[PDB]
C-alpha cells in the first residue's frame, strides 16, 4: 500500500484542461521526497503547506488533479488568478492548501501536423466555482438573440483546440500540470510519509 503517484505523473496520456482528471489518494504512505528531490519539474509552487515537512504529518485525503495547458498559462494555476484558464476551466480557492507541479511536455504532446486533441473552454455565462469541472458543450449565447443549439451570429461553440507544434515558442508548448490538494477532516487520516 504505497501511494501510486506513478500512474498520475508518469501516466501515458493526460486530460484536457476543462475535463481535468482527479485521483483520490487514500490508505497509502507516500515518500513525497520522491517528487521534490527530482530535478525535472518546471514549476513546484506550494501554497499553504511545506512539502518537505508533510513526510511526517497525516492528511485524510490527497487529491491529485492532472491536465495539460500551454506553458504561458501555468502562472494562472494559483489562488486569486483570473483569465481564460483561471475562471472558465480550472479554478483554485483562496484557502488552497496544496501544490501546483508542472513540467514542459513538447516531447510528448506535440505533432508535426499539430496536436489539436488537447482543448480548453473560452466562454461561460459565469466564472467556475473552486474545483468545478464543466464539460457541457452548450452553444454559448453572447449577444441578444437566443440560440437553440444553432451556431452563428452572437452564438459560438464554447471549446477550442491548442495546436501544439514542436516548433512552437516555449510559451505555446504544452506543460503537464498535477495539483496535489490536501484535506484534513475530523475522520482518521490515511496519507502520511516516512519520517
Amino acid at each position, epitope marked *: 500500500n504505497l501511494c501510486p503517484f506513478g500512474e498520475v505523473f508518469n501516466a501515458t496520456r493526460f486530460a484536457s484542461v476543462y475535463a481535468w482528471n482527479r485521483k483520490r489518494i487514500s490508505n497509502c504512505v507516500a515518500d513525497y521526497s520522491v517528487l521534490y528531490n527530482s530535478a525535472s519539474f518546471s514549476t513546484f509552487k506550494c501554497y499553504g503547506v511545506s512539502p518537505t515537512k508533510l513526510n511526517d504529518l497525516c492528511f485524510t485525503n490527497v487529491y491529485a488533479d492532472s491536465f495539460v495547458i500551454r506553458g504561458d498559462e501555468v502562472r494562472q494555476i494559483a489562488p486569486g488568478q483570473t483569465g481564460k484558464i483561471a475562471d472558465y476551466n480550472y479554478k483554485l480557492p483562496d484557502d488552497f492548501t496544496g501544490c501546483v507541479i508542472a513540467w514542459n511536455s513538447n516531447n510528448l504532446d506535440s505533432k508535426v501536423g499539430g496536436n489539436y*486533441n488537447y482543448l480548453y473552454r473560452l*466562454f461561460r455565462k459565469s466564472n467556475l466555482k473552486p474545483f468545478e469541472r464543466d464539460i457541457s458543450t452548450e*452553444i454559448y449565447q453572447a449577444g441578444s438573440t437566443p440560440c437553440n443549439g444553432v*451556431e452563428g451570429f452572437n452564438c459560438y*461553440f464554447p*471549446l477550442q483546440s491548442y495546436g501544439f507544434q514542436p516548433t512552437n515558442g516555449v510559451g505555446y508548448q504544452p506543460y503537464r500540470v498535477v495539483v496535489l490538494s490536501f484535506e484534513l477532516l475530523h475522520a482518521p487520516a490515511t496519507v502520511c510519509g516516512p519520517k
Partner: nanobody
Amino acid sequence: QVQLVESGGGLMQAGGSLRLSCAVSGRTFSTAAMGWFRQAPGKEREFVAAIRWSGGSAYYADSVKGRFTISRDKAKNTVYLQMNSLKYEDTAVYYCARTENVRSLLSDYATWPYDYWGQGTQVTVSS
C-alpha cells in the same frame, strides 16, 4: 490509418438532386469537423460546406446556401452532402475532408486546413 471514402457521384439533369456519402474509418473519437470541397474544370478547389461533429451546426458556403444540405450520422461515421437544385457550375470532383482541430468559431472551417482528404468523386450535371 484514417481513410475517407466518397460515393454517390454520377449524372443528374440540372434541377434534380444527388446525395454524396463520405465514410470515415480510424480514430473516430478525435474528429472535430468534416468538410466538403469541390474542384470544377479549370478552377482552383474551393470550400463547399463544413459540419461540427459535436452539434451538427453547418457552415454552408455562399454559392450553395439554400440548395445543398451537409449532415452527419455519428454512429455510422458518415458525413452526407444533399445537392438539391443542381446548377451547371456544380459539375466538379467533390472531396470530403476531416480535421481533428476543434475551433470555437465555426466559420473558421473554410479558412483553416484539413489533415486527411478522400480520393474524391465526380458529379456531372446534364440535360
